[PDB]
Amino acid sequence: YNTVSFNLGEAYEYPTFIQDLRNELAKGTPVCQLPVTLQTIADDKRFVLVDITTTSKKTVKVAIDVTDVYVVGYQDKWDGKDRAVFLDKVPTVATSKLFPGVTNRVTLTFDGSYQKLVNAAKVDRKDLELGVYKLEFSIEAIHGKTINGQEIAKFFLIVIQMVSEAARFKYIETEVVDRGLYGSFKPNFKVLNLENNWGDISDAIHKSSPQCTTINPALQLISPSNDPWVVNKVSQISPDMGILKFKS
């Protein structure tokens, strides 16, 4: 599997990092001049690894399913040896082929859906601060430490939004660049709305192809200020898209 890296002490490299990740995910046929993921792929090319290193020199290798950009787990350290930590309900190929040879393998009691993650973290997305420093703090809280479901759920919530969602949405990538590289921020109404509708937005754009203009039925989205944002044209939403989900 290929690896893309990001050092939290070099926040300015974030835009390049996200673009390199999109390059690894863009394996499908483009639609309306936008990258698209593949629904199925050989097990040997099923995942991309994201190496995140803190200023404290600790690294966590996060595994992402290239078909849907889902984080399935990560590898950190425990007692000087590697440790594989997996979310519940991930593909069998994930637990069978990722981090080969690592015997300390943990299967968490919760899956990667936002509902299960927030329930375990005990904090909702709207109240959890994102940013390079916050991400490093969450890594420091779990790296080389006994398995604590609550702390690990917080790490997943932060990394999933700063990496996976940013790859999917240029809008989210820009929020992190403007507010989370040299500061901290809580995701606004639009960030959260896009996260909840990646699949639907992608299917809508696919349905509009090949004329790539009209989107009908319209997408009922939300603006940064929590106001209704009705999208019936590709040009209205294409600027916020990084990569679309597979289909048609």
Side-chain angles (χ1 to χ4, degrees), residues 26-146:
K27 304 182 184 304
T29 300
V31 67
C32 300
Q33 296 176 292
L34 293 169
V36 181
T37 65
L38 274 179
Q39 180 172 30
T40 64
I41 194 172
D43 292 334
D44 67 332
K45 296 185 296 184
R46 183 61 178 281
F47 305 100
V48 56
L49 307 174
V50 176
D51 283 15
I52 304 170
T53 304
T54 64
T55 59
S56 58
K57 304 161 293 174
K58 299 180 179 181
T59 302
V60 175
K61 295 173 146 70
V62 185
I64 294 178
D65 187 327
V66 305
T67 67
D68 51 23
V69 204
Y70 286 10
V71 164
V72 296
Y74 62 91
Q75 180 187 281
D76 73 328
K77 313 233 107 179
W78 168 262
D79 189 53
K81 297 191 50 49
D82 294 324
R83 171 172 57 185
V85 181
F86 296 102
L87 284 160
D88 188 33
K89 313 302 182 183
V90 295
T92 300
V93 60
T95 46
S96 295
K97 286 180 166 50
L98 283 172
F99 315 132
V102 179
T103 60
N104 183 347
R105 308 176 79 76
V106 175
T107 42
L108 299 168
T109 59
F110 53 83
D111 68 25
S113 62
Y114 282 129
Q115 186 53 273
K116 299 301 179 181
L117 287 174
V118 300
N119 282 355
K122 301 199 176 188
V123 62
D124 232 298
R125 284 178 284 165
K126 71 178 183 299
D127 303 313
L128 186 62
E129 309 179 85
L130 303 174
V132 170
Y133 192 75
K134 294 296 181 179
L135 176 58
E136 169 151 349
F137 184 88
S138 68
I139 294 177
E140 275 283 359
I142 67 176
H143 191 97
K145 288 173 166 44
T146 57

